[PDB]
Structures are given as C-alpha cells and as structure tokens.
Write a protein that binds this ligand. Structure first.
Ligand SMILES: OCCCCCCCCO
Length: 157
C-alpha cells in the first residue's frame, strides 16, 4: 500500500528506520549541488510522538560530517517544520514505507523561498521505475528533470 503524510490512512511509525538519499531535486539547483547546504545524505528517521529525528551526513572535500535535526509536527496534519539554513516545512506526498519515501520541502530564508524534493530508499538505491515516478512527481511541482540529481553513486561515506 502507498500513502501520503497528509492522507487519512498515513501511519507515521512505518517510516521509522533506515533510509538513504537516492535523488534530490530543487527549483534552485545550487542548493543541492556539490557545495549546497541541502545536499543532505539521510541515514535514518526516528519517529517520536510529535516529531521526527532526522540523521544525515554532508560531504565536503570527500569528507563526511554528521548532522542531526528535529522536525516538529505543525498544525497541518502530515506536515513538519525544522530550522536549518532558514525555516523549512515539509510533507511526504508519497511513500510505500518498505522501499521509497518522497518528500516535498519548502525553505524560506532571507525573505526568499525554494522547493526541494527528495527520493529516499530503504536500500542505497531504488529501481528505475521508482526513479521515474519521482521525476513525474517533480514535474507536477514545476521542477525540471535537469534540476533532479541522482546521488545513488555518492551516498555512502
Ligand atoms: O535535502 C536536505 C533538506 C531536508 C530534506 C529532508 C526531508 C526528508 C523528510 O523525511
């Protein structure tokens, strides 16, 4: 079965655990390019009662750095917020819990905004079919494929 965090049948506990960043996308491409603050490699999601603890690592000069963040539930069901290089809110428009999770995030910094979409997998990669479904979801949000970066060959330390 598949679900959206904003949907009636969402079971947040089912997204707990191991995850890997497979693809990142953004309408401000520089944010997820090599030196971007949003080129974040997810490692795990710890589901708590009113929040999600997100464990990531960033890479620089081929060196990994750990980063942890706490995302709080907002008043919108299925939406979480987190302070990181500005103010962020995000939802999970589609996940099947066992293979993939697709997130859509809005960042606001210095009076500006941009969209970020991420495709995470339980394993370090996903099938080409799931990657295509992600490209379609990015398209629905006005993000061109040229702004979608597959990081499956660079998500391990
Ligand atoms: O690409 C790093 C910016 C935050 C994305 C995290 C969203 C994952 C939702 O579990």
């Amino acid at each position: 079965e598949e679900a959206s965090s904003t949907g009636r049948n969402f079971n947040v506990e089912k997204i707990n655990g191991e995850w890997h960043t497979i693809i990142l996308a953004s309408d401000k491409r520089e944010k997820i390019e090599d030196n971007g603050n949003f080129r974040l490699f997810l490692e795990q999601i710890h589901v708590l009662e009113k929040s999600l603890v997100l464990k990531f690592h960033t890479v620089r000069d081929e060196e990994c750095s750990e980063l942890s963040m706490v995302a709080d539930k907002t008043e919108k069901a299925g939406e979480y917020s987190v302070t990181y290089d500005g103010f962020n809110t995000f939802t999970i428009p589609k996940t099947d819990y066992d293979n993939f999770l697709m997130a859509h995030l809005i960042n606001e910094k210095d009076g500006e905004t941009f969209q970020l979409m991420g495709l995470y997998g339980r394993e370090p990669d996903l099938s080409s079919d799931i990657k295509e479904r992600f490209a379609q979801l990015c398209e629905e949000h006005g993000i061109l494929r040229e702004n979608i970066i597959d990081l499956s060959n660079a998500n391990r330390c």
